[PDB]
Nucleic acid binder design. Structure first.
Ligand SMILES: Nc1ccn([C@H]2C[C@H](O)[C@@H](COP(=O)(O)CP(=O)(O)OP(=O)(O)O)O2)c(=O)n1
Ligand SMILES: [Mg+2]
Ligand code: NA
Ligand code: NA
Ligand code: NA
Length: 326
DNA sequence: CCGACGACGCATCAGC
DNA sequence: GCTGATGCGG
DNA sequence: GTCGG
């Protein structure tokens, strides 16, 4: 946190552009700048020093000079006083309310937590669950609790079918001391890129986790992605654990390394890595790395037997999960 | 200057 | 019912 | 908002 003041500023600018302006590329530009500054191993002393880094241009350079001189940014100071911008920004903190819904609600006069509760009927199902657990989903999860949640998920999956393999990814796999949620990669030998030899593969896991009252609510659910809510069991007389967000992704077993690379993130690491793959003439998603022809069209999946193979194709030295937190 | 900016699953909606 | 576009999320 | 070409 040598430059926490600067990266916090860029993060608030990114969120403003996403939530209020609906300028998704300004949001990514600010996020990338914040990321590159966050790993810069010196205390930044001017915007011209910062502009040397890739993703910091003239505009951000000027904002960093203002912030270093005064300790604040007038642009943000204004944004904070504007009641509409602040209301739109706040409502997007509810899961399922993005920038469109948030501006829609603030237009309808719904602009506080109390206003959301009174108008619960104007929310779809995801938004209703996001409002229900608003305070809980704001809390971090200590790694110690992540370890207990892992134990439950892995043992309940083993009880359904011993051939499942569940791998916790996200910030947990990157070694974070706390996580925003739990991300679970799931494979089963009956589900490959070649065939699906059993139905309900993800559903049976979700259903087992509901039966033991680990999973408490569902935000969305399809054949390969579950997004919902879970809770650790508490002891007699003990306060309940906060409810937590859980995501589960069932990935074809022969595409595991592309899947765990994707799900380990970070999101900015994946964007940098996939952008780099493009420049090297490949495309990477959670299933495959494929070459690009002269026309630009993706070819056939390349053989992959490790995360490191994916790095090798695009001529990157391997980075362990813990060094992917960008 | 200018196009490009990672890639995709699920929910919801318009239009048929 | 479907396909395609959009919002929102990972 | 930034960048490579
Ligand atoms: N725009 C995105 C968002 C996510 N992902 C991938 C990479 C990310 O680590 C994983 C879980 O995301 P999450 O939303 O769970 C974020 P994570 O890195 O796990 O940190 P926490 O806040 O502690 O949960 O999904 C991606 O590729 N592109
Ligand atoms: Mg996560
Ligand atoms: Na730069
Ligand atoms: Na939201
Ligand atoms: Na999150």
């Amino acid at each position: 946190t040598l430059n926490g003041g600067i990266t916090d500023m860029l993060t608030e600018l990114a969120n403003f552009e996403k939530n209020v302006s609906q300028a998704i590329h300004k949001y990514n530009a600010y996020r990338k700048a914040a990321s590159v500054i966050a790993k810069y191993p010196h205390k930044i002393k001017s915007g011209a020093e910062a502009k040397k880094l890739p993703g910091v241009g003239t505009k951000i350079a000027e904002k960093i000079d203002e912030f270093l001189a005064t300790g604040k940014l007038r642009k943000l100071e204004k944004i904070r006083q504007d009641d509409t911008s602040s209301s739109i920004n706040f409502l997007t903190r509810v899961s399922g309310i993005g920038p469109s819904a948030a501006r829609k609600f603030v237009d309808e006069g719904i602009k506080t937590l109390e206003d959301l509760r009174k108008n619960e009927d104007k929310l779809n199902h995801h938004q209703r669950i996001g409002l229900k657990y608003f305070g809980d989903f704001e809390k971090r999860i200590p790694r110690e609790e992540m370890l207990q949640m892992q134990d439950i998920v892995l043992n309940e999956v083993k009880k359904v079918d011993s051939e499942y393999i569940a791998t916790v990814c996200g910030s947990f796999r990157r070694g974070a001391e706390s996580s925003g949620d739990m991300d679970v990669l799931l494979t089963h030998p009956s589900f490959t890129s070649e065939s699906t030899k059993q139905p309900k593969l993800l559903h049976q896991v979700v259903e087992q986790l509901q039966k033991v009252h680990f999973i408490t609510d569902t935000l969305s659910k399809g054949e390969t992605k579950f997004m919902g809510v879970c809770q650790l069991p508490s002891k007699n007389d003990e306060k309940e654990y906060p409810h937590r967000r859980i995501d589960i992704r069932l990935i074809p077993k022969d595409q595991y390394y592309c899947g765990v690379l994707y799900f380990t993130g970070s999101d900015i690491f994946n964007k940098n890595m996939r952008a780099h793959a493009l420049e090297k003439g490949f495309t990477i998603n959670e299933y495959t790395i494929r070459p690009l022809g002269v026309t630009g069209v993706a070819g056939e999946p390349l053989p992959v037997d490790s995360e490191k193979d994916i790095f090798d194709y695009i001529q990157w030295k391997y980075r362990e999960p813990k060094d992917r937190s960008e």
